[PDB]
Structures are given as C-alpha cells and as structure tokens.
Design a binder for this molecule. Structure first.
Ligand code: NA
Length: 211
RNA sequence: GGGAUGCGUAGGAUAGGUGGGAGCCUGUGAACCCCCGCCUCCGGGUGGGGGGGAGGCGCCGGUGAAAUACCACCCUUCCC
C-alpha cells in the first residue's frame, strides 16, 4: 500500500518500538543506471528541523580558519598535526571538515583511512571549503549527505522518531526535493521509482513522494 | 510471481551493496545435543522436527578496503 508523507510521518510513532529513540530514515529506489558516472546522485541538504542528534564535527584547517572553525562550534579543531593523531587510530568523531589548503596532506595521509568510511572531506559532500564556519553550522543544524550506492538505491536519515509528525513530514519533503534537484539530466524514466519511510529497528512504509 | 543464494586474502568466520544503528533476541522457550530437507566455496550455511531449560548476539577489541547483532531500501546468481 502507498501512504502519503503526512500519513507516513504520523505512523513513525507506531513503527518506532525499539528501546531507544530511533532514527527515521528515507529510502528511494532511483531511476538511474549507477554504472554510468554521469547518473550519480550526490549532494547535501539542510533538514528544516535538524537531525536531532549531536554530530561530533572535526575540523582540520589552517591559519585564521582554525579560529573560525572553533567559533563555529566544531568539537575538535586542529592543524595538519591532528593527521598524526588519526594516524595513531584516534577516529573518535562523526564528520571531518577541512579547508582546501590542508587537503593535500589530509588526502594523501588519511585518504586510505577516512575514504572507505565516507569521512574524507570532499567538495561534493559539503565538507571542504574556506567557508568552514558555514559548513560546521550547516552540519550542526542537521545537514546530511546522500549518495546512491552501486545498486541504484539511496538512503538518508531525516530525523528522530521523537519528532512531532509535522516536523518529520517537513524533513521528508525537504530531502525528497533535494533528490529531485540532483536528478541527473541523463537519467531517463521515472526518477523516484520507489520511496519508503522507515525507522532504525522498524518496518518500512512506502510513500507517495509527490504528496 | 514464490522460494532461496551472497565465502579472494587477513580475521572467531560464509563480511553481496549502501544507509540506519546502540542495542537485538529469549520461559509465547536462549546456549547446547540429536534427527531430517535444501544449499555448499566441503569451511560450513540454512529450514523444519524432537530434546533441552537460561541464557545467546551486538557494541568494545583485533583483523580488514569495509565489521559484525538488529532494521530498511536495493543488487546478484539459483531453484520451482
Ligand atoms: Na563492530
């Protein structure tokens, strides 16, 4: 059965039965061919009501920007010298941001470590930039990545199940819209083949993405 | 359509992809034992039955490109 977003938002209350505050997910089977590089969906979006989770942000910057990342609220901040701390297996954070001037050292020394974990700072994921305080403030306000897997599916967290239905409904549209804004011009056919709403431990519920 | 299947090497060992995840399961019967179906890369995996009677599993750690439970969306090959 196909539910509306407003319907699905309200059902999270009932789907969420684990003994913790479950994250609310959105999944979509995408209308692309993920083989071809030009059909890749990748980008970020500021959820209008936040993730509702605290995100330990590390910032590796240079010069004044180290002060900027500090004041933007990044949990740990340092120069190229915290590379050697991750080289020793520190790795206690959720997201790495970085200014372009350090990405030469960061890439070559931590690419092989941060890369496979989707933690490498990357322009395409909104994690590299001299606007490093806006990146941190955008993350801390609940910006999320989304990047199709090779199977052509795509997934994103869009809230906690403790949120009011109407706020979850908002976050779901916002992410749905941001998907459609990254619909590759080469992608033929229906873009959002299917779209489901679920919680971490809970069952799925297919939704009407234009509702 | 229905049913399964998912193992280079390193690693408890059979890690399809990715996202979520700090919890999941269990007297409405856990580990463990036996019997049978199927699958098998011959390591094992998996379904069912009987016994059993309170503990399994994850997180952590280590290994690894990636980490284990659990959940979701997909993908694969196979049988009917
Ligand atoms: Na683990």
């Amino acid at each position: 059965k196909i539910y509306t977003i407003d319907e699905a938002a309200h059902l999270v209350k009932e789907l969420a039965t684990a003994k913790f505050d479950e994250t609310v997910e959105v999944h979509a089977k995408l209308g692309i061919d993920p083989r071809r590089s030009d059909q890749n969906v990748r980008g970020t979006v500021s959820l209008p009501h936040g993730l509702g989770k605290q995100v330990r942000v590390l910032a590796i910057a240079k010069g004044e920007k180290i002060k900027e990342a500090e004041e933007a609220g990044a949990d740990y901040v340092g120069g190229e010298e915290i590379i050697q701390k991750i080289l020793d297996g520190w790795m206690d954070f959720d997201a790495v941001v970085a200014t372009p001037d350090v990405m030469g050292a960061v890439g070559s020394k931590l690419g092989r470590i941060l890369g496979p974990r989707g933690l490498l700072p990357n322009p395409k994921a909104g994690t590299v930039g001299f606007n490093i305080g806006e990146i941190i403030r955008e993350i801390k306000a609940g910006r999320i990545e989304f990047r199709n897997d090779k199977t052509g599916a795509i997934h994103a967290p869009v809230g906690k199940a403790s949120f009011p239905p109407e706020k979850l409904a908002d976050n779901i549209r916002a992410f749905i819209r941001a998907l459609e804004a990254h619909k590759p011009e080469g992608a033929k056919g229906t873009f959002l083949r299917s779209v489901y709403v679920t919680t971490t431990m809970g069952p799925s519920v297919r939704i009407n993405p234009h509702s």
